[PDB]
Every structure is written in structure tokens, then in C-alpha cells.
Design a protein around this nucleic acid. Structure first.
Lengths: 81, 81
RNA sequence: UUUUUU
């Protein structure tokens, strides 16, 4: 199943490409998702990345939590619920 | 096969019976479906109901959109796409 | 601020 990473504070413009670019360097990434409103196709402000190996995921989170992405401070953590 | 109604914000637990119960009072209902993950039958958070009369579907939509079902506010509309 | 149209 890998490990699901939740990213908060993406801009309404954000694309999957940016999630790939940020997490890719840390190890295997199997899925990225920007969450959009169905009717406007705008980003609702969050997204998800699945990484296969926990230690890689944890390194991504340690580096990216608090990143200034565009003009927002990201919150990055393992997905809850 | 009739007017397709989209219901968002069902619980993981949701069953067909809750859709029948809520939509039944409004008129003829021919089909209900809770959308579940294929390999784990957890509800994906949404479902569909098919009603045969336009005015009865409209009534159900206008009355149930915003309903507090369990601890979630439903979004109920005519299916889009 | 935790995956919204089979």
C-alpha cells in the first residue's frame, strides 16, 4: 500500500507536477494527487503523495514540512483518518 | 435509466438502505448505489439514486441537499458528468 | 486542513 502523505497549503493553481518535483528526490513515489473542486477545477488547498518506503517518506516530511511553496508555508504529515 | 442523483458525504459504513429511506418518501426510486472501493468494500463517501419523475427528483434534491446525515452535511444534486 | 460524480 505504501504510505500516504497529506500536504496542506497548496495554491489554487497547484499541479501534480509540483508534488512530483518536491517528493521525487526522496525516493519511490507511486501516486500524487492535487484535490480540486469538481466544478471549477481549482485546488482546494491540499493534496496527497504516496511513497513506498517509510524512511524515505519521513525524510521528505522532515525537509518539506514548513516549506515556503509559492507564498504559503506547507504543512506536511502522514495522512490521518 | 431515469434521473441520476449524486449524494456526497456518506459515512464509510453507509448502506443502500439509508439512501432508500431518505429518497423513497419523495416518489418513485428505481435504483440506489453506494460507491465502495472494489478490493475493500468501504464506502468512498458518495452514492447515487435514480428517480423516474423530474419534479419528485427535484423535490428530493431541494429538500435533502444540506441534510445532516449521521455527523456529516450531505450535498445532494443532479449528477454532473 | 485529510481523496466529490460508477
Amino acid at each position: 500500500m505504501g504510505w500516504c502523505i497529506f500536504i496542506y497549503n497548496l495554491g489554487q493553481d497547484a499541479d501534480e507536477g509540483i508534488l512530483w518535483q518536491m517528493f521525487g528526490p526522496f525516493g519511490a513515489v507511486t501516486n500524487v494527487k492535487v484535490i480540486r473542486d469538481f466544478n471549477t477545477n481549482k485546488c482546494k488547498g491540499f493534496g496527497f503523495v504516496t511513497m513506498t518506503n517509510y524512511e524515505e517518506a519521513a525524510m521528505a516530511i522532515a525537509s518539506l514540512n514548513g516549506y515556503r511553496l509559492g507564498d504559503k508555508i506547507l504543512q506536511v504529515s502522514f495522512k490521518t483518518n
